[PDB]
Amino acid sequence: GEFAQAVKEYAKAVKEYAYAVKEFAQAVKG
Amino acid sequence: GEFAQAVKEYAKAVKEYAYAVKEFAQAVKG
Amino acid sequence: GEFAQAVKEYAKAVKEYAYAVKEFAQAVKG
Amino acid sequence: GEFAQAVKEYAKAVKEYAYAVKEFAQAVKG
Amino acid sequence: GEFAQAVKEYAKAVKEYAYAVKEFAQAVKG
Amino acid sequence: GEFAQAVKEYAKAVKEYAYAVKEFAQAVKG
Numbered sequence: 001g002e003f004a005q006a007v008k009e010y011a012k013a014v015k016e017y018a019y020a021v022k023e024f025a026q027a028v029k030g
Numbered sequence: 031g032e033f034a035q036a037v038k039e040y041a042k043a044v045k046e047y048a049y050a051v052k053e054f055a056q057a058v059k060g
Numbered sequence: 061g062e063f064a065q066a067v068k069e070y071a072k073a074v075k076e077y078a079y080a081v082k083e084f085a086q087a088v089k090g
Numbered sequence: 091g092e093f094a095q096a097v098k099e100y101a102k103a104v105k106e107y108a109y110a111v112k113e114f115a116q117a118v119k120g
Numbered sequence: 121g122e123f124a125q126a127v128k129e130y131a132k133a134v135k136e137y138a139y140a141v142k143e144f145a146q147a148v149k150g
Numbered sequence: 151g152e153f154a155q156a157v158k159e160y161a162k163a164v165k166e167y168a169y170a171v172k173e174f175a176q177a178v179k180g
Contacts, residue, residue, distance in 0.1 A: 004092070006037035011096040013044035018103040020051035025110040027058035028117060036087030037093075043080030044100075050073030051107075057066030067145040074138035081134050085127035094156035101156070101163040104130075108163070108170035111137070115170070115177035118144065122154070126161040133168040140175040147178060 002031060002034040003037070006034040006041070007093045007096060010037050010041040010044070011092060011099070013041040013048070014096050014100045014103065016048040017044050017051070018099060018106075020048035020055070021103050021107045021110065023055040024051050024058075025106060025113070027055040028110050028113045030059070033087060033090070036084065040080060040084040040087070043077060043084075047073060047077040047080070050070060050077075054066060054070035054073070057063060057070075060062070064145060064149040067141065067148050071138060071141040071145050074134060074141050078131060078134040078138050081127065082131040085124060085131045088121070088127050089124040091152075094153045097153075097156040097160050101159040104160075104163040104167050108167040111167070111170040111174050115174040118174065118177040119180065122161065123157045126157060126164050129161075129168060130164045133164060133171050136168075136175060137171045140171060140178050143175075144178045
């Protein structure tokens with residue numbers, strides 16, 4: 001219900017964190 | 031219910047942090 | 061100049077995220 | 091299910107961030 | 121629980137990072 | 151069981167992030 005909903009929004013925020021980390025990694029490397 | 035809300039409020043903080051990580055990456059690239 | 065300011069703003073965002081992680085940790089324990 | 095999966099993805103993101111933070115540390119030592 | 125303990129350790133690590141980035145901001149500035 | 155595996159991976163990622171932060175902290179200090 002709400003928990004299932006909360007998890008979808010968490011999963012989507014994790015994926016945004018994952019790409020932000022990759023751009024940080026490239027900035028530090030490049 | 032109360033825990034689902036804490037997962038929702040954490041998901042918002044993960045997205046806000048992901049944005050700050052990308053902004054800092056852009057400053058390192060720049 | 062520009063880069064000192066971006067580091068300062070990244071520091072504030074890390075500090076904000078630390079507070080959200082501590083709140084999540086408390087929410088998990090409840 | 092879905093929350094264990096999102097936590098696993100977050101864990102992989104954290105490991106990547108740790109590796110970039112160590113590379114950042116190498117840059118700061120430079 | 122193991123999850124509560126791990127998020128507690130993460131909260132500590134992010135708080136330390138926030139303090140090291142702030143020290144770095146001071147270093148880049150002065 | 152599947153959550154206990156996600157928590158194990160998260161716990162290990164958090165630990166790597168914790169030592170990365172101390173390495174960044176030593177780079178800033180030095």
